[PDB]
Design a protein around this nucleic acid. Structure first.
Lengths: 458, 293, 295
RNA sequence: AAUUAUAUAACUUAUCUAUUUUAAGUUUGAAAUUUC
RNA sequence: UUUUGACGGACCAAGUUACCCUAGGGAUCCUAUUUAAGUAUCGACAAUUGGAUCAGGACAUCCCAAUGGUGUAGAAGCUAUUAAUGGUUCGUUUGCAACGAUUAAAGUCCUACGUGAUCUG
């Protein structure tokens, strides 16, 4: 191929160079893209791989901050925010749109990607606006610890008490934890734990003034759908912002935060409030591909996945041997593979952690804290760790087992490129055999078209 | 640089060689290693030891060609001799003086043990009970190797004898005594030679293998014999208390059924159960004396 | 600053103190240990075995106060107790993660050492001589082997492992303090260290014997008859000489046995392996005498 | 290659023959199925 | 198929083809930007197999060096501050460890194996 004076950085780089896309080419809906995954059928061609390179070294979230209004324009506390969270110098796009309406008492629905500032989007108006005064519902216990820890840090600056309630915990133990802690202004609880307390009448939501739901799509899972309904009947909800500001008839302000929303959520919201009274805000990057994050795709058989994983681990070891490198996150679909793979890692004399949903709750909590403490730089975890896991220092996210759905990948994808990330994140996914090639085809096709992935509608 | 000389071929490590990648799966994964029936050897001397013993080798990786010439190349017919980076060998091994050797997983029943101990070989079987220490297992095999035991038995839960570290602890002792691994307790009676009496040196963790309802009535009242008395009048089997488990329940029960006793070694406190290498050593050696006399 | 809790006094150390720097070099660098003649002991109950057995304490550093309760509180009264950060301890030991506690010791004097009576119940009229021992686990295993066997007394010749080297002691895990050991025994004084004319048996089948043809082994040095290890050799007070790890017995040892009327003891090994691990080389011969002497 | 492999062939037992006190197993494979 | 008993999950198995078939692709220390100390012509710093030879740097101070205190009379020591100043050997290693022999001391590490530029096809 002739050497053009100005080549184009590879948008898609594959082991076979003939199909690489260097320059400005967009194919569109009608054109069938010649993807590297187009014909990834006959496993005889070992070691085929393609990687999406990082396009930006500067954080896109920090980019365009000058085009977004200041916190004062949002109605905002700043001195406490500067002391508590100096890192957020300027508001993000989601924060700028979401904060002003919340301070006015308007019910808000926020659809944005992980790490877009959704947590701070409601917390800032929540603090200014403020028998607990605020309730936080979180589906996974892992998220509860982070939310409680994050909320406690903010509370410590403001002298507020925050406690955590993890679902699946025994009724006697749950009561024991409640009695051993002082009264908390804001409570973070999971549907399983919160439902148990409500059934035993350990808490009342009639005096609740604010309810927070994190990961609404996950909270709407059938595992917690019934529990949420039981919570709703005990919770009076404000109908208009005027009632929220009415001292004679105070009611609870509802705020919804999630990355995706199942169809029919409007009907659930309609029976609690008028559809026109719900403020829906969508992030510009919601369901959009991340250019600054490297995504690696490699053809490996189940036998070769262990082979490449050792090679990848050795590559990371070599990188650490030359310059400091970030932690590596390994995602597996099943605990059995984690245990089966974990024994192989133990045979390699490699320090690593094993995390899966069926492990003891007490055991899981300690391991999660240990990883945050930096006890071990290698963590093997299941989808339970794809939600509510801190990955600010994670350099490589390894999906040993291919994620079943795009939504799960997004939660795994959100782990990299977070605010304050010390290292540039990377994503690695493995495909065993012709089981699944459409999912890779869809992801590759979207990148060439620079379009949102199919099926991500919230 | 790949060279062929006098029909002897040794290669040089290639960039991205999938041979090295496949080896890594085989080496550390014993189930895969058993699936491929291979073992890994460390050191020229220990490497040459297997060649002398007639074990079938698989592949050799070495930093210097001198090691191949230093080793007997005549026995290197079945090995692809590869010149590799010195840093790679230490990366491949979890411990390598410039060379590492892959060998076929030997079957000790099929292994050739020449005359010198066979003249001193006894109808004596050594049994390791829940021996979970890789160092002791290899360190143990010296005693079995030097003693001349007809066979060595390792109960289920014991360390893999063919693990390369156990070879380092024994420094080739696996090529000097038959070793049986992952023996089921129900099949242990079949593993004993005819008329063999099973003797258990007793030092307890083995009491945890007892049903709680039947825990207290299930203890065998098996006779205690001083280890200094004659016990080798007929073929005998020796049991070694594990470091973590000690002497197990089934060993005590089997000894009573086999007509044996407790060839009891008074265990000096400070070592709750005599070190399995120490416990193994004493039982074998004077058995040679007892039958020799 | 000393903190008092449940009758236990411990100082809070600060990183970078000159005391911390000295320990790091001693443990990590063996030559510094020889230059300074200092040793390291790890483990709360391992320290307890050392102090109860007469070990000379210098200072004890622990990450958590719980170790002090398990420490030999009787022997801590005059020893500096300082609670130190675990990171400081990690920088010191050859092991990244010690047992939460480590102690500084000077070279213990065997005369003042107190060994438990438990070996004595099984102790034999058998003395052990170590020749050019080079491995720490073997020495610790040898003393742990002796702590399991019951050797009456041990003689260490010149060139052997420093018995008090930190990794040597860890393998012993308290066995160093359970059996008598004599260090820096001169080869000329070895027969005097044993009862005069004590039959000395040399373990011979070695690494030097691998390089040297078997035939050329009796020309200039005294000729020792090769005997089977199982043949009764403890009819008289017996002494056993064991070669160093992967090196073998020295020339002086072979001279010793003939002068005392001893002979070579043969360990029949399967052809295809020239020798085996040295640690149990003592054990195999040590127990052989044990039953023979008991009978 | 993996997985089976009552084509056959062998042995064991029947079988069929002698005396006299092909089928069922297993093994090879004519092959079959799937992947490479 | 409803009931009675003391949180997170829907599939496994190699080659080879020149006997082939189809689809095609070829041939038939720089370099490119950006910056500009010193923009005719240029242009630092930057930004986009074992070995041998020679080391540079970090301080988390081993030796050397400067000091306080002392259960320091002096001198030695012990404890404590300050300091990277230059040094910090040669080998064996039955391969993760350790030993030998020396040294004022043979600190702990980093520096694409820290660092070598045949000849041919």
């Amino acid at each position: 191929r002739p050497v053009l004076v100005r080549p184009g950085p590879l948008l898609v780089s594959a082991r076979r160079p003939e199909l690489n896309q260097p320059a400005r080419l967009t194919l569109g809906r009608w054109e069938r893209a010649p993807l590297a995954s187009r014909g990834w059928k006959h496993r005889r061609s070992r070691q085929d791989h393609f990687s999406i390179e990082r396009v930006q070294q500067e954080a896109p979230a920090l980019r365009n901050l000058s085009s977004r209004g200041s916190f004062v324009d949002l109605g905002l506390v700043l001195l406490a925010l500067q002391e508590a969270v100096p890192e957020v110098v300027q508001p993000t796009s989601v924060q700028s749109k979401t904060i002003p309406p919340l301070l006015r008492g308007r019910h808000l629905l926020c659809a944005a990607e992980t790490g877009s500032g959704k947590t701070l989007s409601y917390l800032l108006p929540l603090f200014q606006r403020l028998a607990p005064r605020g309730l936080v519902l979180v589906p996974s216990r892992e998220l509860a610890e982070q939310v409680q820890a994050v909320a406690q840090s903010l509370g410590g600056y403001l002298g507020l008490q925050v406690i955590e309630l993890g679902g699946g915990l025994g009724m006697s133990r749950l009561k024991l934890q409640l009695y051993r802690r002082p009264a908390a202004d804001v409570l973070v609880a999971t549907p399983g734990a919160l439902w148990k307390a409500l059934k035993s009448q350990l808490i009342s939501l009639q005096h609740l003034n604010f309810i927070v739901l994190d990961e609404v799509d996950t909270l709407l899972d059938e595992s917690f759908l019934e529990l949420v309904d039981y919570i709703l009947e005990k919770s009076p909800i404000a109908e208009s912002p005027a009632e929220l500001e009415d001292p004679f008839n105070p009611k609870a302000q509802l705020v919804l935060v999630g990355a995706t929303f199942p169809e029919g959520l409007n009907q659930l919201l309609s029976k609690v409030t008028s559809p026109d009274s719900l403020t829906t805000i969508t992030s510009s990057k919601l369901h959009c591909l991340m250019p600054h994050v490297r995504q690696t795709f490699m053809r490996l058989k189940g036998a070769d996945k262990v082979t490449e994983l050792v090679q990848i681990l050795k590559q990371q070891d070599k990188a650490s041997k030359t310059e400091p490198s970030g932690t590596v996150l390994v995602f597996c679909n099943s605990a059995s593979t984690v245990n089966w793979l974990g024994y192989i890692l133990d045979d390699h004399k490699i320090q690593h952690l094993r995390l899966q949903g069926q492990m003891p709750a007490s055991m899981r909590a300690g391991i999660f804290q240990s990883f945050q403490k930096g006890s071990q730089n290698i963590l093997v975890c299941t989808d339970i760790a794809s939600r509510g896991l801190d990955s600010v220092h994670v350099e490589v996210v390894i999906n040993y087992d291919f994620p079943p759905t795009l939504q799960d990948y997004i939660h795994r994808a959100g782990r990299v490129g977070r605010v304050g990330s010390e290292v540039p994140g990377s994503v690695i996914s493995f495909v065993t055999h012709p089981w699944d090639v459409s999912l890779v085809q869809k992801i590759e096709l979207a990148a060439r078209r620079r379009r949102s992935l199919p099926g991500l509608a919230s | 640089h790949t060279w062929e000389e006098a029909g002897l071929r040794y290669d040089k490590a290639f960039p991205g060689d999938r041979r090295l990648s496949s080896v890594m799966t085989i080496v550390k994964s014993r189930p895969f290693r058993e699936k491929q029936g291979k073992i890994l050897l460390e050191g020229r001397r220990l490497i040459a030891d297997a060649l002398k013993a007639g074990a079938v080798p698989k592949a050799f990786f070495f930093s210097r060609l001198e090691y191949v010439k230093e080793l007997p190349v005549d026995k290197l017919k079945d090995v692809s001799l590869i010149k590799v980076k010195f840093e790679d060998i230490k990366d491949w091994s979890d411990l390598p003086q410039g060379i590492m050797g892959i060998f076929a997983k030997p079957d000790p029943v099929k292994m050739t043990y020449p005359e010198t101990p066979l003249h001193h070989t006894l109808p004596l079987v050594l049994i390791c009970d829940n021996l979970r220490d890789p160092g002791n297992l290899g360190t143990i095999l010296r005693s079995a190797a030097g003693a001349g035991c007809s066979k060595v038995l390792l109960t289920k839960g014991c360390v893999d004898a063919w693990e390369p570290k156990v070879l380092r602890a024994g420094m080739g002792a696996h090529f000097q005594v038959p070793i049986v691994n992952n023996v089921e307790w129900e099949t242990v009676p079949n593993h004993l030679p005819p008329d063999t009496r099973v003797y258990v040196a007793d030092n307890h963790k083995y009491e945890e293998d007892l049903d709680t309802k039947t825990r207290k009535d299930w203890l065998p009242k098996l006779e205690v014999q001083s280890y200094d008395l004659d016990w080798t009048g007929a073929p005998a089997a020796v049991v070694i208390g594990g470091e973590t488990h000690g002497v197990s329940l089934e060993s005590l029960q089997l000894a009573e059924s086999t007509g044996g006793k407790r060839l009891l070694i008074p265990v000096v406190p400070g070592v709750d159960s005599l070190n399995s290498a120490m416990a193994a050593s004493i039982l074998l050696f004077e058995g040679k004396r007892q039958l020799r006399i």
